[PDB]
Amino acid sequence: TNVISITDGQIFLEAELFYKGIRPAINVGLSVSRVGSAAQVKALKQVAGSLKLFLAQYREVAAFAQFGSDLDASTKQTLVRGERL
Amino acid sequence: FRDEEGQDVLLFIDNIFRFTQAGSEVSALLGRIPSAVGYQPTLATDMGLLQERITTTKKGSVTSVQAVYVPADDLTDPAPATTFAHLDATTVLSRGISELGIYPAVDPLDSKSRLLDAAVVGQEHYDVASKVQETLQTYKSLQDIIAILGMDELSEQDKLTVERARKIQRFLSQPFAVAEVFTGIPGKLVRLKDTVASFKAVLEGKYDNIPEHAFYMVGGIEDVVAKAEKLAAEAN
Amino acid sequence: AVVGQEHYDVASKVQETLQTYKSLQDIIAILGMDELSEQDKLTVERARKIQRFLSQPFAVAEVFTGIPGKLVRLKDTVASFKAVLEGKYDNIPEHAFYMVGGIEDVVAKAEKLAAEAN
Amino acid sequence: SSGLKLQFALPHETLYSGSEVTQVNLPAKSGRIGVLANHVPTVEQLLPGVVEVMEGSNSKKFFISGGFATVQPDSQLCVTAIEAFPLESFSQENIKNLLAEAKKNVSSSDAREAAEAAIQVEVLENLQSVLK
Amino acid sequence: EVEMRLKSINAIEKITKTMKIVASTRLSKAEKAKISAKKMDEAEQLFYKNAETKNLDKELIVAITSDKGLCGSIHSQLAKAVRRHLNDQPNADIVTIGDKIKMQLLRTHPNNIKLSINGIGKDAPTFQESALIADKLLSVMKAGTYPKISIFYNDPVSSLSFEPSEKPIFNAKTIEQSPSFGKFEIDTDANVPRDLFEYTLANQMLTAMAQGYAAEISARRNAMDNASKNAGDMINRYSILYNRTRQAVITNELVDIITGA
Amino acid sequence: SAWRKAGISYAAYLNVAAQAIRSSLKTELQTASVLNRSQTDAFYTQYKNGTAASEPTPI
């Protein structure tokens, strides 16, 4: 808690994603970068905004990927994009 | 500033969680055998001494806007609950909303206000706020079924409510005059009456045909239609 | 560059299968194993077969497990696990991998259980 | 019993169930049968065609896509149906004619498909006659 | 237990709730379809009790189920019903519709089964697919040869309780002659025996499969409600355990502060 | 006409009649139910004593 409260950013490497083979398994759901796109390449910022949006959508829909039931076409597309990313 | 000058002042606590952490810390340096909450025995004493001193005295009023940092929702610890006891109106800034695009990140349904009543803020203001909150509550209530089933099967009344709630949620995001170094969009200093009028007009269905992207990252309803025209030009 | 690309791929895939099993433990538990997708069910079955295959009799534990403590070479283990991950032994019951060594022990146990059960 | 209790049912949306009806003229296997009241019990298939249902309302054309002329001794006629026929919305010619010509063009398949193509052509001609 | 609590609250409780909700939304549409088809089913059954066409004195078994993967107890109930029927007579060409019922029939009587159909329980029933299935069954299997045809399909009473209701199928042999075939006028040149035999084989099977889908999704709703109750009480007891453990952290910090300091 | 003799069967007669009725209609009449009726994916397979799956031919 102390180190999280001190440092601007907290990169979260949790073993669950590593066991899922993400490697280095950055928990984007919990990882935080206060500096953010300010100190980032402009092209990198452009791609990373959409990347972060798509990973957030995948995270909030990732449960249905585990369920694997008859999902909506848009939700299926978002899940496919998130898993591919 | 409140007493001698006799003017309303704005007290801004950077992080009350860091304040209580530092209090427990300085307790750790000294003897200060922790008994009250577990990490600080004095915490109640100095915590009340601090909070009690912000008071609307006969000379002036001090508004204390404190920021509470919850690490991974550590509500079990008494420290966030102690701050939950002091305040009267909360402005929680859950990260999930900011991840969607509304970077202000304040949760419409979890940011309650003590003075949010028709007697204080106004009948029209309270009605608009309650209706918007109900619409957004229905939004996140039906979001799960929309995700697991789809949009077509949803009822037409619920379809209208979810569309209006999406428009309102985009409307929540507002340019900050302090955020131009990261966003580049000039800030929009809106007014409370203008805010209530715009929200009532949007919820009334007069601007349902306007795309939801128009309400995103704008100020007033005039800014809404301006961004609508801009995005229409960009698209085609 | 140490154990070889094939060994690394095999280890990563078996870890993936076992992690899918652990993640879907509760899903099998109270939601229902049959209430699952075909791919997830196949991965769970492969992970269970792998976990059964991880058992190995020990010579010092011969009196404990009741099976002679045969040894397996690294190349044999890599080849057997690569073949298992390909699904070549899906029809074989999970209990065949119990307390065995190489894939030869697996097929011998499968044949003996088929003969004794008929 | 006075009149008839027509039970017009569909797998998607039933039309009538024990409703008063005067004439239930329906396209029998041989021809079409007129049912007025206490008709003789009978069981017999229906070819596609207009199931003329006279009731308190105005003229109601109800083209059928399959059913039985099943009449009870108690005048409770039950005309089973598969596809409904709106009085005016269903009546269209361009799409029907185009589909008929396309099916006639693709009717030169094998004998198993040829019989189906011929029956489809005959039912398309029936639809064209029903269009009026 | 933080990961366990998370996977209990947001991975087996809320999404199971919303999947029960979508099951209920499907239940409404399937109930509408079921009553629509039950209209002509009631018509046919009342006609058949009006004109007794019972068959006297080469058997057919039809396993009709949706594609749901054993939603609690409906598939086990259907499997035990077909097992009992096979014990009564194991000399019928079993036709299986679905996946779970298909593998149940495979593991029970692989020799008796000779036809399997997949991709049926995708959504609410459609008439065209059922009629085509009936045509295929009467063509390749020649259901007319068997005097009796058995169709298996569950029936929910109101919401929860289900039974393996079976409806007899009347062949052309028992239509051309019957105890009360003279009541209803027939046309010999029209070949109405075979026509009515095929019509009942189509209508009864179609509505049987629609009712089986309705019962399957009702049992799915019941099973997911049971799973939701299990998730709820597991979450309650594990949240009590979580509070106990997190308070035990406070007790541990209390003891090491009053011992060390 | 010749469904019993030359055609497939009576069930095929209802199938073709229903398909003609649904497809040969107005554009606005092609609702969701009509879409489900048009879409057929019954992949029947001929099993055997040894569960020899012949082929999942379309219906």
Strand-pairing partners, residue E61, are E94, E150
Measured CA angle at A55 (ends A54, A60), to 5 deg: 100
Which of A19, A22, A70, A83 would best serve as a mutation to test chain C binding (most C beta carbons within 10 A)?
A19
Partner residue opposite C15 with nearest CB, options A19, A66, A67: A19
Q: Identify whether the C-beta of residue B68 lies closer than 8 Å to the C-beta of residue B135.
A: no
Tokens of E216: 């399957």
Distance CA D124, CA F21 (A): 9
Q: Other CB atoms closer than 10 Å to residue B87's CB: what's the count? A: 15
The CA distance from D60 to D19, in Å, is 15
Beta bridge partners of E116: E96, F45
CA E63 – CA E113 distance, rounded (Å): 10
The alpha carbon dihedral of E6, E8, E12, E17 has a sign of: negative
CB neighbour class for B33 (10 Å; exposed up to 12, middle 13-18, buried from 19): exposed
Rounded distance, CA B147 to CA C88, Å? 37
Q: By C-alpha distance, which of C1, C44, C50 is closest to C22?
A: C44
- Chain C residues with CB under 8 Å of A19 CB are 15, 19, 22
Contacts of D120 in chain F (CB under 8 A): 16, 19-20
Where does chain E have alpha helices with state H? 2-9, 14-50, 74-88, 100-108, 127-136, 173-176, 192-260
Q: Are E141 and E117 in contact (CB under 8 A)?
A: no
Give the whole-angstrom CA distance, residue C95 versus residue C112. Answer: 12
Selection from B178, B181, B176 nearest residue A37 by Cα:
B181
Q: With a CB-CB cutoff of 8 Å, which residues 14-73 of chain A face chain B?
A: 30, 32, 36-38, 52-53, 56, 60-61, 64, 67, 69, 71-73
Structure tokens at F8: 């497939």
How many residues in chain E?
261
* Bridge-based pairing state of the strands E148-152 and B62-66: unpaired
Give the alpha-carbon dihedral of B188, B189, B190, B192, to 10 degrees: 150
Please identify which residue in the block is written with the tokens 């049968």. Answer: D33
Which structure tokens are listed for E98?
Answer: 């679905």
From the list E193, E258, E213, E237, the residue with the least C-alpha distance to E4 is: E237
Do B103 and B68 form a contact (C-beta atoms < 8 A)? Answer: no
Token duo for residue C103: 């894939």
Show me where chain E is broken: residue before each gap, C-N > 2.5 A: 57
Q: E181, E53 in Cβ contact below 8 A?
A: yes
Instruction: Give dist(CA A28, CA A54) in Å, integer.
Output: 11
Q: Is the dihedral of CA A39, A40, A42, A48 positive or negative?
A: negative
Three-state DSSP at B37 gives coil
Q: How far is CA B48 from CA B15, B44, B53, B91, in A?
A: 16, 6, 8, 22
String of DSSP letters for B162-217: HHHHHHHHHHH----TT-TTTT-PPP----HHHHHHHHHHHHTTTTSSS-GGGGTT
C-alpha to C-alpha distance for E74 and E206, rounded to whole angstroms: 19
E43 touches chain A (CB under 8 A): no
- Please tell me the distance from the alpha carbon of residue B181 to that of residue C77, in angstroms, as a whole number: 58
Q: Which two tokens stand for residue E176?
A: 């051309």
Alpha carbon distance B158, E52 (integer Å): 51
Say if strands D19-21 and A32-33 run parallel, antiparallel, or are unpaired: unpaired
Q: Is the dihedral of CA B14, B18, B24, B26 positive or negative?
A: negative
- Crossing angle for the helix pair C74-85 and C103-117, nearest 10 degrees? 60
Residue E10 is given by DSSP the state: T
What backbone phi and psi angles, to 5 degrees, belong to E147?
-60, -35
User: Taking an 8 Å Cβ-Cβ cutoff, which residues of chain F contact chain D?
Assistant: 1-3, 6-8, 10, 12-14, 16-29, 33
- Cα pseudo-dihedral E64, E153, C27, C100, rounded to 10: -60
Dist. CA F32–CA F55, nearest whole Å: 30
How is E62-114 classified by DSSP, letter by letter?
A: EEE--S----TTHHHHHHHHHHHHHHH---EEEEEESSHHHHHHHHH-TTTEE
Instruction: Tell me if E118 sits within 8 A of E100, measured CB to CB.
Output: no
Angle (CA) C34-E118-C92 rounded to 5° is: 50
Rounded Cα distance between E190 and D122, Å, is: 18
* Residues F11/E131, Cβ–Cβ less than 8 Å: yes
Q: Please tell me what DSSP assigns to residue C99.
A: T
Written as six digits, the tokens of E257 are: 């502060």
H/E element, E115: strand E113-118
Q: Which of E3, E10, E123 sits opposite A63 (nearest CB)?
A: E10
Token representation of residue E167:
């409806």
* DSSP assignment of B107-126: -TTT---TT-STTTT-HHHH
Joined together, the tokens standing for residue B230 give 């801009």
CB B82 within 8 A of CB B95: no
Q: Are B94 and B107 in contact (CB under 8 A)?
A: yes
One-letter amino acid of B234: E
For chain F, the C-alpha Rg in angstroms (whole number) is 16
Instruction: Report CB contact under 8 Å: E3, A16.
Output: yes
Distance CA E132, CA F44 (A): 10
Question: F20-34 burial, b if ≥16 CB within 10 A, otherwise e?
Answer: bbbebbeeebeeebb
Cis peptide before A24 (omega within 30 of 0): yes
One-letter amino acid for residue B7 of the chain: Q
Strand pairing of F43-46 and E148-152? unpaired
At C115, phi and psi to the nearest 5?
-65, -45
The answer to whether residues C101 and C74 touch, using CB atoms and an 8 Å cutoff, is no
Q: Which residues of A touch E14 (CB under 8 A)?
A: 63
E7: its two tokens: 């996977």
Asked whether the beta carbons of D117 and D109 are under 8 A apart, the reply is: yes
Q: CA geometry: angle at F42 spanning F41 and F45, to 5°?
A: 130
d(CA B186, CA B57): 38
Question: Are F15 and E135 within 8 A, CB to CB?
Answer: yes
Where do we find the tokens 């099977």? Answer: E205
Of B139, B92, B138, B89, the C-alpha closest to B117 is B89
Whose CA is closest to E131, among D63, D100, F37?
F37
CA C97 to CA C77: how far, in whole Å? 13
Give Cα D1 distance to the centre of its chain.
25
Give me E165's structure tokens.
């209701």
Q: Are D17 and D23 in contact (CB under 8 A)?
A: no
E166 in helix, strand or coil? Answer: strand
**Angstrom distance (rounded) from CA B122 to CA B113:** 13
CB contact under 8 A, E258 and B33: yes
Nearest chain E Cα distance for residue C36, angstroms? 7
CA distance E109 to E83: 9
Distance CA E200, CA B217 (A): 63
- What does the alpha-carbon distance between residue B212 and residue A80 come to, in Å, rounded to a whole number? 25
Helices D111-131 and F10-23 pack at an angle, to 10 degrees, of: 50
The residues, ordered by sequence, that sit 6+ positions from E70 with a Cβ below 8 Å of its Cβ are: C32, C34, C35, E76, E100
CA distance, residue E212 to nearest chain D CA (Å): 15
Assess contact for C35 and E230: CB atoms under 8 A.
Answer: no
Sequence-separated (6 or more) residues with CB below 8 Å from residue B27 = B34, B39, B40, B41, B42, B43
Closest CA to A37 of B70, B184, B96: B184
Which candidate, B146, B138, B124, places its Cα nearest to that of B169?
Answer: B138
φ, ψ at C44 (rounded to 5°)? -65, -45
C-alpha atoms less than 13 angstroms from C-alpha of E204 in its C-beta half-sphere? 21
**In the D/E pair of chains, how many CB contacts fall below 8 A?**
76
φ/ψ (deg, to 5) at E97: -115, 115
Structure-token pair, residue D3? 């009149």
Spatial contact of E207 and E41, defined as CB atoms under 8 Å apart: yes
Query: What radius of gyration, in Å, describes the C-alpha atoms of chain D?
Result: 16
- Residue carrying the six token digits 């879907």: C24
B134 vs B136: CA distance, rounded Å = 5
CA E254, CA F38: separation in Å to the nearest integer?
72
Euclidean distance between CA atoms A22 and F47, whole angstroms: 43
Alpha carbon distance A53, D100 (integer Å)? 51
As given in the structure block, the two tokens for residue B170 are: 């985009």
Q: Please state, in angstroms and rounded to a whole number, the distance separating the CA atoms of residues B89 and B74.
A: 20
Question: Quick check: is A59 catalytic?
Answer: no
**Per-residue DSSP letter, C58:** -
CA distance D83 to E99: 30
- CB-hemisphere CA count at 13 Å for F42? 26
End-to-end CA distance of chain B: 55
Cite the DSSP H helix spans in E121-191: 127-136, 173-176
Q: Strands D67-68 and D45-46: what pairing?
A: antiparallel
Report chain E's terminal Cα–Cα distance, integer Å.
Answer: 31
Q: Which position among A23, A34, A59, A81 bears the catalytic label?
A: A34
Write the DSSP string, B79-102: HHHHHHHH-SS-----HHHHHHT-
Whole-number Å distance between alpha carbons of B25 and B14: 18
Q: Residue B30 class from Cβ within 10 Å (0-12 exposed, 13-18 middle, 19+ buried)?
A: exposed
Neighbours of chain C (3+ CB pairs under 8 A): A, E
**Strand-pair partners of E163:** E155
Distance from CA of D96 to the nearest CA of E (A): 20
